[PDB]
Amino acid sequence: AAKKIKTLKLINKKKRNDLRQRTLRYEEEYESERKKIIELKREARKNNCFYREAEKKVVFVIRLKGVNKLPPKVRSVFRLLRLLQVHNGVFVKVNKATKEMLKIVEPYVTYGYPTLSTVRKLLYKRGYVRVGKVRRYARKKIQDNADISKHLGKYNVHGIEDMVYQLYTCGPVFKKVNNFLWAFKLKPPRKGFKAKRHAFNEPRPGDWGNREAHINELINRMI
Amino acid sequence: AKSKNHTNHNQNRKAHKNGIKKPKKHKFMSRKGLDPNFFRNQKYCLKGIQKKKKELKLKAKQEKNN
Amino acid sequence: KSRGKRSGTRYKFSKKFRKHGECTANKYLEKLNYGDYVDIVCDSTQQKGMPFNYYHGKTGKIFHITKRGVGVLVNKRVKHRIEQKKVCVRIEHVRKSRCNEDFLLRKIKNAELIKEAKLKNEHINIKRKTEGPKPAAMIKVPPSKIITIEPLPFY
Amino acid sequence: GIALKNVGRIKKHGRKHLVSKNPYLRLLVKLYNFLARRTNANFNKIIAKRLIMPKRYRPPLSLSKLQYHMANHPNDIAVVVGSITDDKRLFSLKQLKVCALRFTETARKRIEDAGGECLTFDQLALKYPTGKKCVLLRGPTKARTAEKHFGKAPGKPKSKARPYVRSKGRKFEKARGRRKSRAYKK
Amino acid sequence: IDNSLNTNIHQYHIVGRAIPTAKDKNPNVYRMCIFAKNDTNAKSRFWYFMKKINKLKKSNGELLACEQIKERFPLRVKNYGVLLRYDSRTGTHNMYKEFRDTTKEGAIAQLYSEMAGRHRARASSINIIRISEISSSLVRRPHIKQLLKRRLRFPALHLPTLQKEYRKKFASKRPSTYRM
Amino acid sequence: QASLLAKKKPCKKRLQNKNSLTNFAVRCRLNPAYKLLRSLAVLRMRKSILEKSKNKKEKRVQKQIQKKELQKINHDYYKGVAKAVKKKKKREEKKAK
Amino acid sequence: AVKKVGKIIKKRTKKFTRFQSNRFMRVKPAWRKPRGIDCRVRRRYKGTNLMPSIGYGSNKKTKFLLPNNKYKYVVKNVKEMEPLIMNHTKYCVQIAHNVSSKKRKQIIERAKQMNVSVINAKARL
RNA sequence: UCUCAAACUCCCAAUAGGUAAAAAGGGCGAAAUAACUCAAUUUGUAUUUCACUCAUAUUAAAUAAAAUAACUCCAAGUGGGCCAUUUUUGGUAAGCAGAACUGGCGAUGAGGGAUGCUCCUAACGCUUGGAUAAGGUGCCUAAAUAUUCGCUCAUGAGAUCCCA
RNA sequence: UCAAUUAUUUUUUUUGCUGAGGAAUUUUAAAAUUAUUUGAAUUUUUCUUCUUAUAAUUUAAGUUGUUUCUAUACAGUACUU
């Protein structure tokens, strides 16, 4: 037994050290990407040419609409998407297939691109995670690492910071990490919406569909 | 007395409730009506192979026994 | 009122413009093995072995072959349940399917690619790409070639 | 609100604890549940689950059938979650080691005479903790006569369900609707 | 800055092109300026124009560049002339109006307000075709000509208005419209 | 008894959750690197105005070339719009007569 | 509203009333669930005879506990008080309604010696 | 050359529908077995037995409170229905007659629509605090006699989906 | 003068409501913080970082404390209902 307690402490120390070095490497990566984008845009300005940034790869989708009176396909898509209760949020991996499914539920959902600060804040302050045995999960607020060091130990992406890193720019271990989080139960916005009645692009007050960048401002109000 | 004579309404809604059921997808199935000639030939083949296999197994067992 | 065998088949079973006249001779040669996938496409240059309306445009496994007949396992939606139905047709209407061939081609291509990769011990994502988002890029447009636009006045 | 299948309440099926009020059986389920909960062995859980089962599901087992099952490893102990019944078809028996719930009187006499061993479940647990070198068996289950009236309905094509009749002679349910001669066939 | 007098109409320069294919190696590149309540809205309006004028949709094309324009000298006056296409209840009309303002953005905000007031045009129903700053000698509408006079001055004659602090429910005597 | 697997221990009684952003201990416990990053941020922050105040002039001066180049890009953008207005005007003028 | 006292929260007071017992004499006052094709009460109309339901229930770690802070036990004989010496701090005796005054006195006296609270103490003297 | 067609058709969308996406399998080989096949004891078939070997450390495309699944039994009540959008046939039309898809209502409260079985919001254990929706913010009536630019005088103004 | 808006961050002025639980061996272990102690690092530091050892503590590991009052009462007009 005495060796086992000692050994456990060594494992605990190694994990914290390991996570720290990965964290630092991630932090270095983020700034490098951000700076490079600025430099590239300036380079494009300098010559005659345009740089274009990637399509954003992830999308945070917020549901907008009640349980009642929903078309049957739309209800099915919602179930797959994983937004049930009416203000639920989830990250979705942009592809072709996901985007089409998203298109079907479009008048019922706002969505957009996170930015790093938004992900970090949301994951700490409102992240819940699925703790229990297979398909009987039970909802636990994240709180500390030993929970996620269990499930994502195999995939080597344990550490809550590490979860932020995988999500923010789509890492290889995406499907598990997204699945593993419980759907975000969100609080309403401080200054309210404008109209669940219409699209954001309709020139009226209105909210549904793609909001690209501006989703973060909305998330910040309603966190 | 004049009373509405049809509608498919609500039937679909009932139907999806227990889901649209699938067949049970068995690997083998009865060959009863399927081609006389070919299947009788097969019955002979199975008997032949089985007889050879049985004779070999018996031979191993009796030989092992001594 | 009535609902007899060829009911409501007018345009469906009729041939397209310039496609009248007997089933081509070559078409009898096509190979059918057990468990091959097969479409059921009606004709009407042949009369024997013509299938009922529903099995038009459906596709299934071949489970039984006779002198000129082909048994086809077809799924039919009956209210709350799909059930399997054995449609006996004659060869003129049964057509060798292509949906299977996509998968089969993929298997062959994958096998070669995998064998080479594994030999080099170069780890590989053989599974289908399934088109991702567009990656970032840098694009030269000549500043003299660009055109600028406005919405048109009405007439 | 929210939308979930059965509003988020999971539905398990089958038994939940024994119905039987018999003290000995209550003692046995307590014991095996304890063995199940502590050990990780699948043997303990299955024995516990089968032990709870209702009267129709655990069948009586013939000695002859048991001998056929034990034949290729006759060193070891058969456990049978039912009652074992005797047979007059079976000529002789080669000293088996059997745990069963209940023994027919003649069978116990025969097994003992043959030099075999009759174990109760308490004894099986005590001697063997994880079912080590054991063989779980159970008898013909669907073969019960009642089940022959189940399945795709009697008189719906090909289906082999038994009808129900007052008596099985020629004037009872054997004319119109069961042959070519008198309306439709079976 | 005062939020109450704030507006959110900006100008965005958008550049886009068709996705390249075997048929089109180098496509015709399109740029436009579009007056919008945000950048996404700007994009959407640009896409609608792409569908209406050229042969393109969002799905088979790509954005080359998106950038905000903002006025160079926002505190000196300009006379902006605008030409619109709008739809009425009967049908469709072209029309030309002039606006005195401080930026293009201000001009469009007033114009939307005007079109709603005089013509019942909803934002959906307005299409901007060309807005440009016009010289004082070339002005065509009388109310703008009057402003452009040499020594503009006039008396104030608008009613008082004031903070919640003083807008109380009881007063010593009748206040005066007059002012000095 | 010998056969039985060792005793397992029951799930944990629910405390108040502790804030994952503003409780310093909790945050550090979650993220080990956070202490270093905060301290770095404080260390940068500490630095008084004199260095910044001299430097601002340098920042502006080295931006000048960029400023000219950018002025040209927007200048070109405007010219293109004016040209489009003239081209449409000729077209309309032709159409009218 | 909620009726807190110390460790004892009870959510609801005003004993639930059978609908219509206000305005017909025959209708008994103690509760009944309305059935009815359409009737207000089953249908949960605003401001009318709010139906009881289980979620109102007292907390499970304080379920039956008197403001005495001790569980009530009914006693009709001194022999029956033989257990409750070992729980004198947590159960309180009530002397049963039937019990005659001579016996009742004896029960009160035994309880006092045993150091257990007696709730209907002054009864029948 | 002017204009046309539920029961006309060179051509012809969207939506809806089907099949496809690998391990009880598939590969490429060998060897067996048969009264079948073929000219063919090896010409195939099909089965069977042996070999060799196919992705799997994200799972032979995604995504999934995807096994709360299958399946069996025994039995209930029900088999008068009705309304909205959209599609729609009869009828001058009808809060009329008849259909199609979906959602409701029925069996369903609560908040809003002044008022209302069906409209909008939203579906309900008991509570405390928070922040909103739908909708409002002169008073009745909780929020603005808010800000900002227009238009509007009516000797029967005008004022909120369904909806009067 | 030094904007405005994103970006990444770091605080602060008042303050509303809440306090389940009660750990005979996961109320620990670790985190954090303090006074020491050893070696590195680098933005070079009076909140510099890590990690070496020792003590303590709470930001950990769901509210505790002081003072009144009821009251020096015996049921009162307070308090329950």
- Can you point out the beta strands (E) in chain F? none
Spanning CA of E20 to C1' of H80, the rounded length in angstroms is 65
Q: Do G2 and G9 touch, CB atoms closer than 8 A?
A: yes
Residues in chain C within 8 Å Cβ distance of B14: 80
* Residue F14 Cβ < 7 Å to strand I: yes
Question: How many Cα neighbours within 13 Å face the side chain of A97?
Answer: 6
- Taking the C-alpha atoms of residue C51 and residue C57, their distance in angstroms, rounded to an integer, is 11
Residue G105 is encoded by which pair of tokens?
């006195």
Candidates F70, F83, F85, partner chain E, best to mutate (most E CBs within 10 A): F85
Spanning CA of A196 to C1' of H93, the rounded length in angstroms is 39
Q: Which of E64, E65, E124 is opposite residue A203, by nearest beta carbon?
A: E124
Task: Please list, in sequence order, all residues whose beta carbon lies within 8 angstroms of the beta carbon of residue A62, skipping any fewer than 6 positions away.
Answer: A83, A87, A88, A89, A109, A110, A111, A186, A215, A218, A219
> DSSP assignment, residue G23?
T
Neighbours of E59 (CB within 10 A): 8
Which one, of A92, A89, A28, A25, lies nearest residue A56 by Cα? A92
In one-letter notation, the amino acid at residue C94 is V
* Residue F61 Cβ < 7 Å to strand I: no
Task: Please list, in sequence order, all residues whose beta carbon lies within 8 angstroms of the beta carbon of residue C5, skipping any fewer than 6 positions away.
Answer: C52
- Taking the C-alpha atoms of residue G104 and residue A169, their distance in angstroms, rounded to an integer, is 82
Which one, of D30, D73, D52, D47, lies nearest residue D129 by Cα? D47
In one-letter notation, the amino acid at residue E120 is R
Neighbours of G20 (CB within 10 A): 15
- Taking the C-alpha atoms of residue B34 and residue E167, their distance in angstroms, rounded to an integer, is 98
**Quick check: helix, strand or coil at residue D10?**
coil
- Taking the C-alpha atoms of residue A104 and residue A108, their distance in angstroms, rounded to an integer, is 9
- Taking the C-alpha atoms of residue A205 and residue A69, their distance in angstroms, rounded to an integer, is 23
DSSP G75-105: ESSGGGGTTGGGGTTTEEEEE-TT--HHHHH
- Taking the C-alpha atoms of residue C135 and residue C132, their distance in angstroms, rounded to an integer, is 8
- CB within 8 Å: A85 and D2: yes
Which one, of C69, C71, C74, C42, lies nearest residue C59 by Cα? C74
Question: How many Cα neighbours within 13 Å face the side chain of E102?
Answer: 4
- Burial letters G40-49, b for 16+ CB under 10 A, else e: ebeeeeeeeb
- Taking the C-alpha atoms of residue G87 and residue A206, their distance in angstroms, rounded to an integer, is 68
Task: Please list, in sequence order, all residues whose beta carbon lies within 8 angstroms of the beta carbon of residue C61, skipping any fewer than 6 positions away.
Answer: C35, C36, C37, C38, C72, C73
- Taking the C-alpha atoms of residue E66 and residue A44, their distance in angstroms, rounded to an integer, is 13
Locate all alpha helices (DSSP H) within chain D, ordered by sequence: 23-38, 42-52, 63-70, 105-113, 121-127
Task: Please list, in sequence order, all residues whose beta carbon lies within 8 angstroms of the beta carbon of residue D178, skipping any fewer than 6 positions away.
Answer: D155, D185, D186
- Taking the C-alpha atoms of residue G117 and residue G96, their distance in angstroms, rounded to an integer, is 15
Chain C nearest CA to A47, separation (Å): 9
Residue D24 is encoded by which pair of tokens?
């000995």
Neighbours of A57 (CB within 10 A): 17
Q: Do C44 and C13 touch, CB atoms closer than 8 A?
A: yes
What contacts 24+ positions apart, CB below 8 Å, involve G101-106?
G101/G125, G103/G77, G106/G78
Q: Which of A50, A204, A211 is opposite residue E40, by nearest beta carbon?
A: A211
- Taking the C-alpha atoms of residue E50 and residue C92, their distance in angstroms, rounded to an integer, is 50
Task: Please list, in sequence order, all residues whose beta carbon lies within 8 angstroms of the beta carbon of residue C98, skipping any fewer than 6 positions away.
Answer: none
Angle between the N-to-C axes of helices D63-70 and D105-113, in degrees from 0 to 180, rounded to the nearest 10: 40
Residue nearest to nucleotide H36 (CA to C1'): B41
Residues in chain F: 97
- Taking the C-alpha atoms of residue E36 and residue E16, their distance in angstroms, rounded to an integer, is 17
Residue C5 is encoded by which pair of tokens?
């065998």
Instruction: Write the secondary structure of A84-110 as one string of H (helix), E (strand) and C (coil).
Output: CCCCEEEEEECCCHHHHHHHHHHHHEE
Resolution in A: 6.7
User: CA dist E135 to B40, E110, E148, F79, Å?
Assistant: 102, 20, 11, 17
Tell the burial category of E10 from Cβ atoms under 10 Å away from its Cβ (0-12, 13-18, 19+): buried
Question: How many Cα neighbours within 13 Å face the side chain of B44?
Answer: 6
User: CA dist C18 to C21, C45, C56, C106, F39, Å?
Assistant: 9, 13, 21, 36, 83
Residues in chain A: 223
Q: Which nucleotides of I are covered by protein (CB under 7 A)?
A: 2-11, 20-21, 23, 26-27, 29-33, 43-52, 58-63, 81
Which one, of C11, C3, C5, lies nearest residue C52 by Cα? C5
Residues in chain A within 8 Å Cβ distance of F20: 124-125, 127, 142-143
Compute the 3-state secondary structure of chain C and give helix, strand, coil in percent, each to the nearest 5: 20, 25, 50
Residues in chain F within 8 Å Cβ distance of E130: 84-85, 88
Q: Give how far the C-alpha of residue C24 lies from the chain's centroid of Cα atoms, to the nearest Å.
A: 21
Q: Do D43 and D121 touch, CB atoms closer than 8 A?
A: no
Chain A nearest CA to D2, separation (Å): 4
User: CA dist A75 to A186, A209, B14, D2, D8, Å?
Assistant: 20, 17, 16, 12, 17
Residue nearest to nucleotide H64 (CA to C1'): A80
Q: Does C146 touch chain A (CB under 8 A)?
A: no
Residues in chain D within 8 Å Cβ distance of A79: 3
- CB within 8 Å: E31 and F88: no
- Taking the C-alpha atoms of residue E51 and residue E43, their distance in angstroms, rounded to an integer, is 12
- Taking the C-alpha atoms of residue C73 and residue C34, their distance in angstroms, rounded to an integer, is 11
User: CA dist A161 to A21, A164, F24, F36, Å?
Assistant: 11, 5, 16, 14
Q: How was this structure determined?
A: cryo-EM
Its sign, for the CA torsion E59, E65, E66, E69, is negative
Residues in chain F within 8 Å Cβ distance of E13: 77
Q: Which of F26, F29, F69 is opposite residue A45, by nearest beta carbon?
A: F69
In one-letter notation, the amino acid at residue F13 is K
Which one, of A132, A124, A220, lies nearest residue A180 by Cα? A132
- Taking the C-alpha atoms of residue A138 and residue A136, their distance in angstroms, rounded to an integer, is 6
Chain C nearest CA to E153, separation (Å): 39
